[PDB]
């Protein structure tokens, strides 16, 4: 929670930021498949869905990757304290 | 590092996952506006850009949010909890 203001002095200048995105497990529903699984936890950063790297991927594209395999969802996840 | 496989037993069954996204500062360029500002650090999650909350947003959404303000850029950033 820090307000930052960057002001350019030229139009061709850059801010100097390389921004990226991670998909993460925000919530797991009670009495759900995810709830009962041993290996997935709230806070987990999702590195792969069904064999595809999710780094920088939009949630819309993540949804299509999930819908592609009807019945099963494979992921590679990492503990938030490990990323 | 953790493999997850969730298998539905019924068609309308849900996985029980709420997946969200975080845009974060992967790298700051040397001697840049961002570097010289002091308040942004690598690892920071970008919570707000030019007055709009960024949660669930794609990098493409953030790019247009950033380009909305022509000469200047306002953000709210927040430390990565595990830094």
């Amino acid at each position: 929670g820090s307000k930052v203001t960057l002001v350019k002095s030229r139009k061709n200048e850059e801010y100097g930021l390389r921004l990226a995105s991670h998909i993460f497990v925000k919530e797991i529903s009670q009495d759900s498949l995810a709830a009962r699984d041993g290996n997935i936890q709230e806070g987990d950063v999702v590195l792969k869905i069904n064999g595809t790297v999710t780094e920088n991927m939009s949630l819309t594209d993540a949804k299509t990757l999930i819908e592609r395999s009807k019945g099963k969802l494979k992921m590679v996840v990492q503990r938030d304290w490990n990323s | 590092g953790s493999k997850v496989t969730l298998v539905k037993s019924r068609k309308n069954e849900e996985y029980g996952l709420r997946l969200a996204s975080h845009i974060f500062v992967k790298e700051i360029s040397q001697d840049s506006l961002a570097a010289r500002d002091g308040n942004i650090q690598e690892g920071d999650v970008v919570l707000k850009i030019n007055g709009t909350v960024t949660e669930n947003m794609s990098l493409t959404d953030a790019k247009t949010l950033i380009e909305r303000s022509k000469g200047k850029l306002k953000m709210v950033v927040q430390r990565d909890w595990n830094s």
Partner: peptide, 8 residues
Amino acid sequence: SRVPDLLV
């Protein structure tokens, strides 16, 4: 990844 970082 196939999706590049955003540079600004």
